[PDB]
Amino acid sequence: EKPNFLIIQCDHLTQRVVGAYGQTQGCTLPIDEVASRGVIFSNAYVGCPLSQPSRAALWSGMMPHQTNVRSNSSEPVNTRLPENVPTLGSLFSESGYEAVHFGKTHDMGSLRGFKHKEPVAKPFTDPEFPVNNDSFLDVGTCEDAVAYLSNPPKEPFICIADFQNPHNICGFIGENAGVHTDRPISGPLPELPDNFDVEDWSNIPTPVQYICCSHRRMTQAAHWNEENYRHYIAAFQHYTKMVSKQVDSVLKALYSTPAGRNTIVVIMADHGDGMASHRMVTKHISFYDEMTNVPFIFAGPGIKQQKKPVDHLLTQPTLDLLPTLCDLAGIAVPAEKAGISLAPTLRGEKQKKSHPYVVSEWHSEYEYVTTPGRMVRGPRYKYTHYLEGNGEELYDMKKDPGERKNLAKDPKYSKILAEHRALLDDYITRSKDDYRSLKVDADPRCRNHTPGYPSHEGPGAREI
Numbered sequence: 001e002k003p004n005f006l007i008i009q010c011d012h013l014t015q016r017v018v019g020a021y022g023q024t025q026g027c028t029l030p031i032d033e034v035a036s037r038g039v040i041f042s043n044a045y046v047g048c049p050l051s052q053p054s055r056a057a058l059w060s061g062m063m064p065h066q067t068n069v070r071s072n073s074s075e076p077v078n079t080r081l082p083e084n085v086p087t088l089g090s091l092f093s094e095s096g097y098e099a100v101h102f103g104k105t106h107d108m109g110s111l112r113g114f115k116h117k118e119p120v121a122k123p124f125t126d127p128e129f130p131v132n133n134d135s136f137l138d139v140g141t142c143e144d145a146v147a148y149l150s151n152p153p154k155e156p157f158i159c160i161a162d163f164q165n166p167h168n169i170c171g172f173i174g175e176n177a178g179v180h181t182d183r184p185i186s187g188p189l190p191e192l193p194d195n196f197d198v199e200d201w202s203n204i205p206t207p208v209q210y211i212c213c214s215h216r217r218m219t220q221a222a223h224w225n226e227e228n229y230r231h232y233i234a235a236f237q238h239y240t241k242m243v244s245k246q247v248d249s250v251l252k253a254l255y256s257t258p259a260g261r262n263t264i265v266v267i268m269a270d271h272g273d274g275m276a277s278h279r280m281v282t283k284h285i286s287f288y289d290e291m292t293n294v295p296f297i298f299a300g301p302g303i304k305q306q307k308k309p310v311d312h313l314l315t316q317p318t319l320d321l322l323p324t325l326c327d328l329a330g331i332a333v334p335a336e337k338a339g340i341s342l343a344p345t346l347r348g349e350k351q352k353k354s355h356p357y358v359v360s361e362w363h364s365e366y367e368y369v370t371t372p373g374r375m376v377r378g379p380r381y382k383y384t385h386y387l388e389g390n391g392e393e394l395y396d397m398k399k400d401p402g403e404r405k406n407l408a409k410d411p412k413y414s415k416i417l418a419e420h421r422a423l424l425d426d427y428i429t430r431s432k433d434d435y436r437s438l439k440v441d442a443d444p445r446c447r448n449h450t451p452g453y454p455s456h457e458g459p460g461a462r463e464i
């Protein structure tokens, strides 16, 4: 009849690690099996590479400057979503769907309309990698979703399973902070990425120069060697395999009932992880693909299999998931929502409405450093601007997908730069963005040493 929906979201999950995108084998087989039945987008940019802003934005179908959840800080710095704002869950709930949510919330009110159940951490010992409450909560989340999908009560439903992993990578970094010899592992060690090194630190913006100061985990990884970073990637894959096994459990529960086959499965992330690219660990300030270009996978009744990743559209899950699911469910979407339904692409029809560019925002994490930034991703180039120092990046995503050569200061590229600044102005105007009025709050002690993370000195912005 009317379709059910199962949204499986993972914190930190990256395209590179997901086999469906063609770079890594062996980490996400169950996700790749869903993908093979359906469609995956190659350009799927989140409106902010940080948990709370992305999630606030996602489930209300807005951008972060509009929700006013621009960091992981609570009220009053950030504002909870008012109950008069339509939401994925209110839209679906008001139409007669049962709407349930399991796992990580971190939503600041944007989950309104979902009946939420809190997972209970179920601890266990891993013999090779550090595991913590992130991993343990996921055992609970998985048990909750399994029990629900193994017996609904009832249909039509929409269900979200919000997993923590591979977020446990953060705990790994803390256990392996600073100069160190790595704990031996039994796997083959993954190679560093081709974009690992930063070739010229003078040619990236001030806030990116000093992520080692403002970001605790960059502080902790600042002086790591190549073995260290390669163990970081092995651990990322481990936690990715861990959550994939839970995705597998949840899907087995889905298809153990007749409801399963009438269910549209979406698989995504709120943001990704640096994975050593550009020396990065986790996420902070920067807009590189590793962090802002997430897995975005659909399969189910009425969605046509496409073997080739959709790479001719710029997608923005943060905006587009709300309209896409509402479309497929036959629910009217409030005209103020700026997202675009991908349901035509998913049904194997031509996509006549599409995003001419997609955007991402940075503000702060916990308001130690406030250094607002904006990314504009056009059909071919990615442009970056930061207020602090008026820094700019410009990257050729066709010939330099690894983002190793900033072209912003290359005269050959000035009309391309002008054109992309002009898109940012378009975004700022149409979205009512206050970017240009915003103030930096970046202590000079966090901009002290020579640019770049290996040259980092001191404890970082934590003090104070």
Ligand SMILES: [Cl-]
Residues within 6 Å of the ligand: 214, 364, 365, 366, 367, 368, 369, 370
């Ligand atoms: Cl911060």
Ligand SMILES: [Zn+2]
Residues within 6 Å of the ligand: 210, 211, 212, 213, 214, 446, 449, 452, 453, 455, 456, 457
């Ligand atoms: Zn530093």
